[PDB]
């Protein structure tokens, strides 16, 4: 029982569903956490964290009890002392994966959280297989322009020497290549990993938006890595409803965010590799991969062009040119009829999404500091919202690189 | 133990052990955050006071290399008898300008912590009545203001005895423009001070009932009905909003004042509390070209601004609304320069904050900060600060917020 105040409507919600965590945030009654991005680091131990999925899957659909739940129970319970482990009905996984998008405080996207299409992946067992899924998945996901959103799970950790793991970090990203002269060309974020690629024996032919291709590992072995078909790769290139200047710039980008490198957790079951899509928020291509100085950090590219007083600071020469930037990717996007949304209309959605959620659910965990957009913070309705944050499972967690962690054969 | 923060975008990592002294809550439990709520949540006793008033006392004298002095050693027992006596005790001068700078020092949401150390303080603790505040606030108003080259400042008046007789400016900030309700709903003014100038109106304040009127001062001294004044409108310095291109801005005819100056919340000092302590800095942009002349429920000029931007206002992907508020902020910070008043753009503010947060994790081994409040409202991730791992505790002295007067004051006369 607690409140959450909206100032700009003065409109309250009560949050009982935080009652229902009990995964540590990372913050204690001393010090809060809210800004750190990753505040917090057998028998019975798994039947716990399974017996309480379970439990919450039969509530969505009130068989609580019913001689299925205490059943599937056992069944669970005895998978474990013999497996080691349980399987997860194809009800209970397209639930879970539903649920942890439902709860992913970070996402803005939500309002959409029941409208995902879940991928079964759980029978593959190459690297091979996992790029045909993949394959599927972007196709499906893309859908020729009316993006949808789509997982793939793949099989669940099996002993950590055997996981599947997509090591890019999206399946459809740029690469980034260090300079002769020091500097970087293409996507700054991805270097290492670009890296990583050529060293795997990828041509890169050292362009400003090379698609780089995926590197897949499957059942634990050493990764394999596969060109993504081009037609699969829908990308939209960047030009502004005014200036004319704007498609000399040489910028686009891809329409499909599909994020692979996070970790899905069921009723204490761990897929490693489940790569989830979604379509675009323009800030998230115009505000962090376009201006962020430390990806492709194009600000006083389009100033210099914007003819703007880049003397000093308080000229704002970098909020101009960075609004102009987003209006030029959300015009792309819509003259192409790819997907998108802008930072308005996606908060907009998200209050509502919160409305919906306290009234049916009792709650609904939220970053404000992920939610609240990287641009005209205050002038979206999320920025006056108060935000409680808190762990309910299912979830996506994040998971160390696999490089880091994969002693190659 | 230690803690690390992380800057996302120069991959710096800096070392927190200053977390450790922190004591008050900071509403958070271990399952659940409350980073983004605004207030998370009689007087104290004899057994309390004691060791909060030993621990800024350790504190200052800690401060000063001179702990375990034989002047700290004194002023502790000095500290511990009147507490003893007279169930309170009365912070040294020093003590008091100490106090207020740890206080902004400590200041989680707020970005111009580099400053915190010049902070002219105005001790008003011989202050008796609200003629008296009134006197001490006009004195804080022209020393900060200073011609437009504006100077930190806080003026203290007398702490809390039993809580019945506090001293309270009922002004949220000591300059403000009054709002007015007409009968048809709409707002004349600022329509966050709307309450507020009825209060005043109550009181007998004649309002001019325009867009920009200075709100009367209502001053409380001595748990006593609080008593209106006129600032002296030659102290109240405001600057005419225009903007460096469109030579049409000027016809919207925004202003604002120049001296931001909060007066509702409480110092905390040792256990002490100062119910009534206005600061007073200079403005970060944002405040007004985003908050002040933006929010919905504020002056709300976006629509006619970009009108007469001729934008694209049929839908919000055309991002008007983000279009126009650039050249507010441009038209705000060009103005208070171009009339040389002190104000700082975001942008500034923001790679001075990690300038600072950086120095105080060196000198000091940590920078409470409030990163939702520290992220400009506008442009947040072209700003240093977006990308900056903060920790955010409570350490003391300390600002907090405190009910606002005329939901707690028992009125007196007929
Ligand atoms: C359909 C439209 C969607 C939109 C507009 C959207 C928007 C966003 C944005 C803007 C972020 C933060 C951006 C960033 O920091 O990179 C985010 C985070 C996230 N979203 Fe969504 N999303 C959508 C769909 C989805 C889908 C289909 C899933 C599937 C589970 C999902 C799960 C998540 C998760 C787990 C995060 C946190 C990622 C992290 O911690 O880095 N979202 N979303
Ligand atoms: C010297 C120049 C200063 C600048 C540029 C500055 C900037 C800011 C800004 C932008 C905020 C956000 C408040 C809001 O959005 O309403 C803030 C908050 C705050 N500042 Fe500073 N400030 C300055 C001086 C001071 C001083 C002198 C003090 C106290 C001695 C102080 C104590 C605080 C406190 C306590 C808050 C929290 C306000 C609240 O919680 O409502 N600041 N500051
Ligand atoms: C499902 C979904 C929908 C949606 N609309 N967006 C996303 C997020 O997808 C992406 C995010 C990023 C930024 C990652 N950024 C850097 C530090 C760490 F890597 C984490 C934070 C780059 C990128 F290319 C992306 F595709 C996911
Ligand atoms: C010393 C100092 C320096 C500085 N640069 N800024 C400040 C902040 O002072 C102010 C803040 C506001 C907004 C109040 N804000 C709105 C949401 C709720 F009402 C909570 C409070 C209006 C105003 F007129 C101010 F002066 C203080
Ligand atoms: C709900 C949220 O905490 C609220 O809108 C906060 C967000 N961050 C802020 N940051 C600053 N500087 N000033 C504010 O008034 C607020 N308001
Ligand atoms: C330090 C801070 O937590 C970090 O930069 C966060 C802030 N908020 C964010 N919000 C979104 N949507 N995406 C991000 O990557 C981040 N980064
Ligand atoms: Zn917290």
């Not at 322009?145 to 990203?173: C, E, M, Y």
Request: charged share 25%; glycine share 6%.
């Amino acid at each position: 029982f607690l409140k959450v105040k909206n100032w700009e409507t003065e409109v309250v919600l009560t949050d009982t569903l935080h009652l229902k965590s009990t995964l540590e945030t990372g913050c204690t009654e001393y010090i809060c956490m809210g800004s750190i991005m990753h505040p917090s680091q057998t028998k019975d131990q798994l039947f716990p964290l399974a017996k309480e999925f379970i439990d919450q899957y039969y509530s969505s659909i009130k068989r609580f009890g019913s001689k299925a739940h205490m059943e599937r129970l056992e069944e669970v319970n005895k998978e474990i002392d013999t497996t080691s482990t349980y399987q997860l009905k194809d009800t209970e996984l397209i639930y879970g994966a539903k649920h942890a998008w439902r709860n992913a405080s970070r996402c803005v996207g939500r309002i959409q959280w029941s409208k995902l299409q879940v991928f079964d992946a759980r029978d593959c067992t190459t690297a091979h297989g996992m790029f045909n899924y993949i394959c599927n998945h972007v196709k499906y996901a893309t859908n020729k322009g009316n993006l949808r959103s789509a997982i793939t799970i793949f099989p669940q950790r099996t002993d950590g020497k055997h996981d599947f793991r997509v090591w890019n970090s999206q399946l459809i990203r740029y690469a980034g290549y260090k300079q002769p002269d020091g500097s970087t060309l293409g996507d700054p974020a991805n270097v290492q990993f670009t890296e990583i690629c050529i060293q795997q024996g990828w041509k890169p032919p050292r362009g400003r938006f090379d698609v780089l291709p995926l590197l897949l590992q499957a059942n634990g072995n050493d990764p394999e890595l596969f060109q993504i078909p081009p037609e699969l790769v829908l990308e939209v290139p960047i030009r502004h409803p005014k200036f004319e200047w704007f498609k000399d710039l040489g910028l686009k980008w891809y329409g499909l965010p599909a994020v692979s490198n996070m970790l899905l957790e069921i009723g204490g079951l761990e897929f490693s590799a489940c790569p989830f899509s979604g379509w675009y928020m323009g800030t998230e291509i115009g505000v962090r991969d376009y201006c962020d100085n430390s990806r492709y950090n194009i600000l006083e590219e389009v100033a210099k062009k914007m003819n703007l007083d880049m003397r000093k600071t308080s000229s704002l020469w970098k909020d101009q040119a960075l609004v102009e930037i987003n209006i030029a990717v959300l015009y792309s996007f819509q003259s192409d009829k790819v997907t998108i949304v802008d930072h308005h209309s996606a908060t907009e959605s998200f209050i509502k999404h919160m409305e919906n959620e306290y009234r049916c659910r009792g709650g609904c965990p939220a970053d404000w500091v992920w939610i609240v957009p990287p641009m005209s913070g205050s002038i979206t309705p999320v920025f006056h919202q108060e935000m409680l944050n808190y762990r309910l499972t299912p979830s996506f967690e994040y998971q160390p690189d696999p490089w880091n962690t994969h002693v190659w054969k």
